[PDB]
Design a protein around this nucleic acid. Sequence first.
RNA 1: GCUUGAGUCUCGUAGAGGGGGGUAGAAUUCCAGGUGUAGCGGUGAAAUGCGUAGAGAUCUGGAGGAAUACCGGUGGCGAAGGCGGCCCCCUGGACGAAGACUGACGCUCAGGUGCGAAAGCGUGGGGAGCAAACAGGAUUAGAUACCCUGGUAGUCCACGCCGUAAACGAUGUCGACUUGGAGGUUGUGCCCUUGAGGCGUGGCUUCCGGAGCUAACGCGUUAAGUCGACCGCCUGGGGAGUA
Lengths: 66, 88, 70, 117, 104
Amino acid sequence: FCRFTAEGVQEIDYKDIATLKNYITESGKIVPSRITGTRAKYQRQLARAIKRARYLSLLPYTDRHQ
Amino acid sequence: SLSTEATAKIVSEFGRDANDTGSTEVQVALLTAQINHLQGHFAEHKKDHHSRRGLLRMVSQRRKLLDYLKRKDVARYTQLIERLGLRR
Amino acid sequence: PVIKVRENEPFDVALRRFKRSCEKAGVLAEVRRREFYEKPTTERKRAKASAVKRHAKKLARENARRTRLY
Amino acid sequence: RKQVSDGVAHIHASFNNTIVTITDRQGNALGWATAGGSGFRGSRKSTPFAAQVAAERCADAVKEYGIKNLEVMVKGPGPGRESTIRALNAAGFRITNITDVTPIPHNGCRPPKKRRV
Amino acid sequence: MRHYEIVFMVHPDQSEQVPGMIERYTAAITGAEGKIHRLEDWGRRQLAYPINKLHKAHYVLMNVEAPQEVIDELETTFRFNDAVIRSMVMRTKHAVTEASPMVK
RNA sequence: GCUUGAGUCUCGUAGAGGGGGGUAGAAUUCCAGGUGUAGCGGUGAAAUGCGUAGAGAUCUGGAGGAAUACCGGUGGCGAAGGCGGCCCCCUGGACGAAGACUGACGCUCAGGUGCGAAAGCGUGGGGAGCAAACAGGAUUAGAUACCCUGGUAGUCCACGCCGUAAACGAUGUCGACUUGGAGGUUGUGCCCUUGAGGCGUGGCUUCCGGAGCUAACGCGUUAAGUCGACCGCCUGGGGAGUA
Ligand SMILES: [Mg+2]
Ligand SMILES: [Mg+2]
Ligand SMILES: [Mg+2]
Ligand SMILES: [Mg+2]
Ligand SMILES: [Mg+2]
Ligand SMILES: [Mg+2]
Ligand SMILES: [Mg+2]
Ligand SMILES: [Mg+2]
Ligand SMILES: [Mg+2]
Ligand SMILES: [Mg+2]
Ligand SMILES: [Mg+2]
Ligand SMILES: [Mg+2]
Ligand SMILES: [Mg+2]
Ligand SMILES: [Mg+2]
Ligand SMILES: [Mg+2]
Ligand SMILES: [Mg+2]
Ligand SMILES: [Mg+2]
Ligand SMILES: [Mg+2]
Ligand SMILES: [Mg+2]
């Protein structure tokens, strides 16, 4: 069940970090859309914004890198 | 692609009521204006074989329209290639 | 699977919790896959055989459930 | 030997061997023991039983440093993935952390060719 | 002409020269008929991984409507200023003037 | 002359479409230094190899190349070859919604021209990992192999050449017509959006199957059904796609 359809959002912004922590796991991997239920238009916009915020240190790449 | 105020500026120059937009004189010049533009794209990008295929579509689509006009009206054909800068 | 062990908790409760966090991260499934090179032919040939495996068990085995075995 | 209170276990498991290294929390080795150096050779040294004496002979070599807490960082796959840390509780050590530090490339270098056995 | 979003990360020792940096990078836009639409300052923020042996940086957001030649010129201003480490200048379709979820 | 074929204009959409330039994280290798001490690596088992001139393990610092985990999906884009981090710049196509506009401007195409995986060639760089050749160690009756330790062309880059693949859907392009069922993906309209609902309508797409066709296998509105237009091709096996 997709939550970005219920919100009706049009662009998953990479700066909304309280949202983007739901869509990574403990190790920081991007969670598959089969378990979150994200619609395929939004899962492409989800991973595009998580990779934009790993560049800007908002999110980690892996849980181990120091 | 050709900008918004460029296709509105060539329709208003070669069309009848600034509204026809699909006449043969209008369509040739909008293809000519892009072929003339894309010469600078491919003097920089010679390995761009996928978008040159879109350029060679406009050339074949221009020749089919100039061959249409020439027997439909020799007088409008002769004045169209005299103004755009074309040789045939 | 970086696990800290919490206070007042035994070792077996941290050992079996470590045998769970290493399977969500895909640790063992990643190392065996990157051990040898798999061709771009071979990676695409098995990616379609499993899609046939998933779909010819879903729709083509329900037939025996519509029918009966005894 | 300056008595250090705590440290880290580094268990490098591979499919043929297991190297156990007790260190401190800054990365300085104090003593080590491997599965093949336990009197095990060839096929015997790549079992889970052969890798508990790797942890036993290594705990027996860091007795003079006086280590109480000892976290474990497991690297690599292997049969001694589990039984090397079972026998590190048997030396009386309370576990602090258990870490998994297998190196995962994000499709970097090209791995060797498949074996046509 | 073209809407952009910039966000540049400042070394935490030169964090007092950021009100100087925002005033020079505002005026470089407006000297070329460029709307500077919103402007934020996120404070010293904890990093998620250490870039170049430090764990903290000072983040600035800046939304601009400039010609693209004074935007490329701003990218090579961040390239040689050693106070700024990372920047991510990124084109936008419409204009945004909302508050951030971390000005919030 | 006409407007349904073909095209043009306005407004949006989705996308590893193409060319160019930056940058990021993880990992391998090497180099340097600390700690440490007798083994490491590999195999069915070993041995060659590396180690007491201090290896392997572990920690720190530097260098360099190549590729982009997760997302990722009988998902997407492209004429085909094919295309995967993220960011900017230049650019080709498809598609949808209503509304005007030109008025058969169309389809196919021998010769011709362009594009065309990988390997290979010429010139100049680059070279971390992998690896034809070559080398040693095994295996074996032998082993010019399989397996092991190494290792050079090559793989990468710029610009030319080559012009071939099981280059395949083993199915030439274009238009028309003929029962259905369950999905993916991308639009758009309308009904109380009373929520992702219900209800129509376009593009592309996976799986099943009816009539029909088929030597059978199977195909089956994305035809291998029923047609029309044009092109390519074939005529027993070998000799031979050879002289
Ligand atoms: Mg066009
Ligand atoms: Mg090997
Ligand atoms: Mg009409
Ligand atoms: Mg008319
Ligand atoms: Mg020909
Ligand atoms: Mg090549
Ligand atoms: Mg060469
Ligand atoms: Mg060369
Ligand atoms: Mg070399
Ligand atoms: Mg070899
Ligand atoms: Mg052929
Ligand atoms: Mg192919
Ligand atoms: Mg094929
Ligand atoms: Mg054929
Ligand atoms: Mg069928
Ligand atoms: Mg027939
Ligand atoms: Mg047919
Ligand atoms: Mg047939
Ligand atoms: Mg010949």
